[PDB]
């Protein structure tokens, strides 16, 4: 429907046959896309401006499975696992780059990728409702039993399924060797699907052929025993199978998926798979066995029960899944919802156990993106593109309830740190607009106190909020707010002074107890010495400090811009606090400058000290709005003189969107269709220039001898930096 | 008893009170006890141990061993005698070098390559098979290798077949990768050994053995587009032949030529039936003609019917 | 072959196969019972000299059986001297030579595993004791890449024959350090 | 005997710093329980001790804690974590790590139930940013706070503790000797290195 791709030169291959694809990512960048061009390389891809696709050389065959585990870029590269797992971690996001992490699993064939690293999250979402909970009761964690801790260590331990006993080598951070050799039954033959995470610290797995027998090698294994040794169990748990055979009729079923979830107690995806189509359900309830009818009149054990069953049409199945044994009846969003796209056009997306029929609007594999329902267009249909439906949560009309569930999941998205993309699921910003108003109003009042460590993110949470359509005023603000704030606080404690009666930084400020004008009078009131760290220091103003000067100046200028037809015109920053602290960095810049002459000055003229007229005009707009001030006193019009000083051409970060509000977006491979600030930025291109997409624009090795303070403080992800992009300079 | 013992064995195994069951059964119990008037015990005892022998392998395996309940002279070898701390990529340096070195198929082994067949996959079995291949260097020694090849392919021939027409050929002419390997004088008997098993396949060909026909039910439409029958062989067969003459394109031909040379010329043999070669827009007859130019070889295969169609080849091959 | 080539040259070896297996004597199973230009005398892991085409590398694969079984016989450092050594004090050199003790460490472990020894049955570690000594009066080479040594320790991770082995293994390191202490340092 | 424990985790705040720190206070530390570090054998030696350096939760909503550092000889690993720690870090400046320091406290744990047959048990962490946050642990049952840190890493257990920041003095020390049991934090210092900090 929208969110369409296509690849120009390569098409399905017609002279291969087919292959096997997966894909599976639970976190940020959840495209994988395995295919066959027209053995063959492996591609990822962000969510947001897809245009700049990226793939890479494998160096094995048929490439058959990948499950990422957490946020921190890997693959598996199953199949004879030539070139196992690693890290990108090289300048960006864009580079596969395997290291020696490797486990030589000689001449196999697996199919498993799992063991995350630590529990589920706990969600009681229709009972809190998340009203005055503060994350307390409506976000928590179950106790969970960590699998091989020593601190919680995680290795890519998987089974054997062209083999028939077990995985070892394992050699996680510790370069250590590790090598061993266990029986495992001395028998098997195996066809499975993984289930790992379960109540102690063991795996699950089970399947062997399919409907033709009923075996299913049940393997419960134990790993941590001892350092530098391993004893892998044998458990067999009870056995079981799928009981569609039970009909006299037919038995034509052979199941070819039976995948499981991270939850080892409520399902049992076993299904009826040419001409035909039946899905099952069990379920682990222990009970007792009926010991009777032996006469006139241990009981823990475990026999299978049934969940759901019924006739169906459907091929493809793509993936199967909050908690359960709650009365979801307030409840219309996509809680533990199971979907699968039907081959026959359009997808009849239905939760489980009713199976009816939803809102069609009549006039291979896949795996669910997250609670926002936008699938993956992997069906069978050939190596095409991936797609996009409609994300309705439910057939009804409830705004109120529409924004409760959204500000539920935005607040999940925030405490969990993961990436978010209910953009596509939200209305136009208005009700987008009363939701953040809500939810700054909730964080301001119920936070109670992780507000200290949980702001920054959600400032830009804000701005994909007010990302999306006439609102761009927000973005422009809340990023500079957010700049501002993060670039004082790291140049605050940066001070190697002497010591005092209290911290240098912590006196600093209480700069706000002090008068009007002349800055002069108050840095030599509050002290003057002990400010100084190193020669060292000449290379901030000039370069990159220069900013917040030329910022105080896109002020003044743009004061008086009220009559513009914009609300805010470009920005307004009358908040005071903000300004408070903007201050305090003009009167330490300025006995900065005291302190070297290579400061940041009006550069134009009137130099015979522009920086004093500049700052007192800013504390005597601070002063006429700090506490509930007015806007536009007298003093606006003589401020609003235009002194023969202010530059202009700054960068003002920002970034393009996804506006597909509600019918198609075709767009190819490539060429897209429309619709740190140390210098580094010249006309054209001068380095290969690793850039960013949220306000970035910068270079790739920073260039510099001693300034590693903040390009090691920004070498990893930056605000909201999961869109740190690469791209070449032009040629002729 | 036996039987209810081997399904109650897919339980944890806790109880095991059928195991000790069982084996109370097997035991000498019955000593002329009740007033047995048989008076053949000793013969239905000997039936009825080596019937628990038959079965219950798989209890005799996933728990302890028996006390040796048989007190016979030599019981079945054949066995699954898969070494268990050892992974399945042990076929080619324990068995084809040696059957290779070897005069025979080494029967006994064979068993233990039938377990390996219905395993593991047709497609990674023929494929490390066809890779262990071409090591030889030495045109005699691959023959043999294809010789012992051929016949080791047997009990599997249909899906066998397939999974090599469909795969292994487009695995290695598809991408220049694997052009490499081609160039090997192992090719030539690679060309015979595809032409070989494509008759075998096209001949009349029942296969009905019970681990086969238990396991023959699957899906598969090959995708073969078609740009005298709908059969999965022969439909394989053309998207085949299709792309050898496609790859008998121009504009780049190293490995490859010399591939489809030895096919052609392996291809002519007396009372074959193959190349069925349908008349109506197809590549064979332009095939023959640039083949031409690598005498009356091509001239013979062609001649399907001596069908009206069949003159435009002869006139071509007329030169 | 070159790729681009005729088969002119392949069948051309195949109708040169027969006259050289005119050439050709028996498995080249064992000849060295004698503890006293000669046979059984390879140079680097291959023994024959005409550079014809003979059959598959049978006689190109190193015998290495060859070499286990006159290593592992005591008053062989006479016969692997003349066999493969030269100038055995004016041409140090290390050759490859240690990787075949390398295995003579592996069998070692075998020894103490295979059956535990029948639990002491015998006085086969007698024998085993007294090849090692053999080897350790040949220890002028034998920690070429020292290192090397360490991968045995690797192959000893196999089947965790750390039962019984290790004593016997520390016993013949101390037979062997004990002549090298003050002769190298203890960076190896 | 001689059970130290080293803790640093200023790396998101301050790198190079520690690169300087490390040769004046550090790496002489290291040679009071070593005879220099080259590369020899490493087992239940009494003075052993861990290497534990995280980042906060600026850029990492994946990962806490990945220590690993039993007995590493008290050389390799050691100078390997100590030149191989990390460069990353970003976000701000509010807070680095406490709830590390908390599952500092779980190592001494391991070491009753590992150190059997008293010792005299030490520990010292590095911290360039003044930390504070209201979570505790997120990866083990016990939970607590800074207070609830320090008063088991004093009372709890006799645990001698001091921090040798870079030459600033944030609003950290003064607290950290509210305890009863001396913490002796007195360790930060230009003159050379103390015999037990």
């Known amino acids: 429907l929208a969110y369409v791709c296509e690849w120009e030169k390569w098409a399905k291959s017609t002279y291969c046959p087919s292959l096997p694809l997966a894909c599976a990512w639970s976190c940020r960048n959840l495209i994988a896309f395995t295919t066959d061009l027209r053995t063959h390389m492996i591609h990822i891809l962000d969510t947001e401006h897809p245009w700049e696709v990226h793939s890479v050389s494998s160096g094995h065959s048929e490439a058959i499975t990948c499950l990422e585990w957490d946020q921190s870029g890997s693959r598996l590269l199953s199949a004879d696992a030539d070139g196992q797992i690693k890290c990108w971690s090289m300048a960006d996001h864009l580079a596969n780059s395997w290291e020696s992490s490797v486990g030589s699993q000689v001449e196999g064939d697996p199919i498993v990728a799992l063991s995350w690293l630590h529990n589920g999250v706990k969600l009681a979402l229709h009972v809190e409702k998340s009203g005055a909970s503060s994350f307390g009761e409506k976000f928590s964690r179950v106790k969970f039993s960590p699998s091989l801790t020593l601190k919680p260590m995680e290795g890519w331990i998987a089974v054997t399924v062209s083999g028939l006993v077990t995985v070892s080598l394992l050699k996680p951070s510790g370069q250590v060797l590790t090598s061993t050799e266990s029986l495992c039954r001395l028998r098997g033959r195996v066809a499975l699907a993984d289930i790992a995470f379960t109540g102690g610290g063991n795996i699950v797995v089970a399947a062997a052929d399919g409907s033709s027998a009923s075996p299913v090698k049940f393997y419960k294994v134990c790993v941590s025993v001892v350092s530098e040794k391993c004893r892998i169990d044998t458990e067999i748990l009870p056995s079981l199978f799928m009981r569609c055979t039970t009909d006299p009729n037919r038995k034509d079923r052979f199941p070819a998926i039976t995948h499981l979830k991270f939850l080892a107690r409520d399902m049992s995806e076993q299904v009826l798979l040419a001409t035909s189509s039946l899905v099952e359900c069990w379920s682990l309830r222990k009970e007792g066995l009926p010991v009777n009818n032996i006469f006139q009149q241990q009981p823990m054990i475990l026999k299978w029960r049934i969940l759901s069953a019924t006739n169906d049409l459907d091929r493809v199945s793509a993936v199967a899944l909050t908690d359960l044994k709650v009365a979801s009846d307030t409840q219309f969003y996509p809680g533990l919802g199971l979907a699968l796209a039907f081959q026959d056009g359009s997808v009849h997306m239905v939760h489980r156990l009713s199976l009816q029929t939803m809102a069609v609007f009549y006039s291979k594999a896949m795996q669910l993106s997250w609670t926002s329902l936008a699938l993956v267009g992997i069906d069978n249909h050939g190596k095409l593109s991936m797609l996009r439906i409609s994300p309705s949560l439910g057939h009804p009309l409830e705004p109120k309830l529409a924004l409760q569930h959204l500000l539920f999941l935005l607040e999940y998205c925030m405490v969990t740190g993961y990436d978010w993309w209910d953009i596509l699921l939200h209305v136009q910003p208005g009700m987008v607009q009363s939701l953040v108003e809500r939810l700054h109003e909730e964080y301001t009042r119920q936070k109670p106190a992780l507000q200290q460590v949980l702001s920054t993110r959600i400032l830009a949470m804000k701005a994909s909020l007010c990302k999306l359509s006439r609102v761009c005023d927000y973005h422009t603000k809340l990023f500079l707010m957010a700049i501002t704030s993060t670039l004082k606080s790291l140049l605050r404690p940066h001070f190697l002074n002497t010591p005092d009666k209290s911290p240098g930084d912590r006196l600093a400020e209480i700069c706000a107890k002090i008068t009007d004008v002349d800055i002069d009078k108050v840095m030599i009131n509050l002290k003057t010495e002990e400010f100084v760290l190193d020669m060292n220091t000449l290379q901030a103003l000039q370069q990159l400090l220069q900013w917040v000067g030329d910022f105080v100046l896109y002020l003044l200028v743009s004061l008086p811009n009220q009559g513009s037809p914009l609300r805010p015109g470009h920005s307004f920053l009358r908040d005071g606090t903000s300004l408070g602290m903007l201050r305090e960095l003009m009167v330490v810049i300025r006995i900065w400058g005291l302190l070297k002459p290579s400061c940041l000055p009006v550069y134009t003229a009137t130099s015979d000290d522009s920086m004093s007229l500049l700052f007192r005009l800013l504390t005597k707009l601070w002063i006429c709005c700090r506490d509930e001030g007015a806007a536009s006193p007298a003093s606006d019009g003589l401020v609003s003189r235009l002194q023969p000083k202010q530059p202009l051409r700054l960068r003002f970060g920002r970034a393009p969107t996804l506006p597909s509000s509600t019918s198609t977006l075709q767009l190819d491979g490539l060429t897209r269709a429309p619709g740190l600030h140390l210098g580094a930025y010249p006309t054209e291109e001068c380095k290969a220039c690793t850039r960013c997409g949220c306000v970035t624009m910068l270079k790739s090795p920073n260039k510099t001898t001693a300034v590693t303070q903040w390009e090691q403080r920004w070498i990893k992800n930056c605000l909201c930096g999961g869109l740190w992009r690469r791209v070449p300079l032009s040629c002729s | 008893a036996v039987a209810w013992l081997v399904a109650h064995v897919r339980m944890l195994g806790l109880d095991e009170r059928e195991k000790s069951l069982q084996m109370i059964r097997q035991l000498a119990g019955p000593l002329y006890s009740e007033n047995t008037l048989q008076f053949y015990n000793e013969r239905v005892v000997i039936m009825n141990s080596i019937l628990e022998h038959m079965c219950a392998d798989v209890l005799q395996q996933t728990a302890t061993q028996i006390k040796f309940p048989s007190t016979g002279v030599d019981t079945m070898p054949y066995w699954n005698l898969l070494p268990p701390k050892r992974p399945i990529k042990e076929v080619l340096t324990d068995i084809f070098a040696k059957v290779l070195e070897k005069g025979w198929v080494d029967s006994r082994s064979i068993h233990i390559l039938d377990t390996l067949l219905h395993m593991g996959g047709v497609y990674w079995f023929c494929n490390n098979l066809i890779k262990e291949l071409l090591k030889e260097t030495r045109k005699e020694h691959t023959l043999r290798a294809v010789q012992l090849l051929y016949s080791i392919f047997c009990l599997d021939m249909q899906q066998v077949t397939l999974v090599l027409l469909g795969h292994i050929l487009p695995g290695l002419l598809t991408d220049s990768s694997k052009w490499h390997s081609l160039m090997d004088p192992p090719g030539t008997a690679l060309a015979k050994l595809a032409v070989w098993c494509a008759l075998s396949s096209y001949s009349s060909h029942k296969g009905q053995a019970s681990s086969r026909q238990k396991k023959r039910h699957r899906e598969d439409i090959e995708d073969y587009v078609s740009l005298n029958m709908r059969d999965p062989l022969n439909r394989v067969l053309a998207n085949l032949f299709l792309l050898i003459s496609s790859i008998l394109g121009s504009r780049t031909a190293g490995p490859h030529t010399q591939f489809v040379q030895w096919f052609m010329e392996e291809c002519v043999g007396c009372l074959e039936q193959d190349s069925r070669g349908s008349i109506l827009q197809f590549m064979p007859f332009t095939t023959v003609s640039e083949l031409v130019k690598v005498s009356p070889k091509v001239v013979l295969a062609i001649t399907d019917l001596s069908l009206p169609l069949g003159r435009q080849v002869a006139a071509k091959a007329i030169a | ?188 | 005997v001689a059970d130290v424990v080293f803790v640093i985790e200023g790396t998101a705040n301050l790198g190079p710093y520690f690169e300087e720190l490390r040769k004046h206070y550090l790496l002489p530390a290291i040679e009071y329980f070593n005879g220099g570090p080259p590369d020899f054998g490493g087992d239940y030696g009494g003075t052993q001790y861990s290497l534990v350096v995280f980042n906060t939760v600026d850029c990492a909503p994946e990962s806490y804690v990945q220590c690993h550092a039993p007995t590493s000889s008290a050389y390799e690993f050691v100078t390997w974590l100590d030149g191989i720690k990390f460069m990353g870090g970003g976000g701000e400046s509010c807070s680095l790590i406490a709830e590390g320091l908390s599952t500092a406290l779980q190592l001494f744990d391991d070491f009753k139930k590992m150190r059997e047959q008293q010792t005299h048990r030490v520990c010292l962490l590095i911290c360039n940013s003044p930390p504070y946050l209201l979570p505790a642990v997120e990866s083990t049952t016990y939970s607590g706070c800074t207070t609830e840190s320090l008063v088991q890493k004093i009372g709890e257990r006799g645990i001698h503790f001091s921090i040798v920041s870079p030459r600033k003095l944030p609003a950290l020390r003064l607290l950290f000797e509210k305890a009863a049991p001396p913490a002796l934090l007195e360790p930060l210092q230009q003159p050379a290195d103390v015999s037990q900090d």
């Open chain 3, 1 to 188: 072959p070159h790729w681009l080539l005729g088969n002119l040259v392949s069948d051309f070896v195949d109708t040169f196969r027969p006259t050289a297996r005119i050439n050709s004597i028996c498995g080249r199973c064992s000849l060295l019972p004698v503890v006293n230009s000669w046979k059984l005398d390879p140079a680097t892991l291959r023994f024959p000299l005409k550079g014809l085409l003979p059959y598959d590398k049978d006689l190109f694969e190193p015998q290495t059986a060859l070499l286990r079984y006159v290593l592992e016989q005591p008053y062989s450092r006479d016969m692997v001297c003349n066999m493969l050594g030269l100038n055995k004090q004016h041409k140090q050199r290390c050759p490859v030579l240690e990787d075949q003790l390398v295995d003579l460490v592996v069998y070692a472990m075998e020894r103490s595993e295979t059956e535990e020894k029948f639990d002491d049955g015998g006085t086969s570690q007698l024998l085993w004791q007294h090849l090692s000594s053999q080897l350790i009066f040949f220890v002028l080479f034998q920690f070429a890449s020292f290192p090397h040594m360490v991968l045995s320790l690797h192959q000893k991770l196999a089947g965790r024959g750390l039962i019984k082995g290790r004593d016997h293994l520390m016993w013949v390191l101390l037979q062997f350090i004990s002549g090298s202490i003050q002769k190298n340092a203890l960076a190896d």
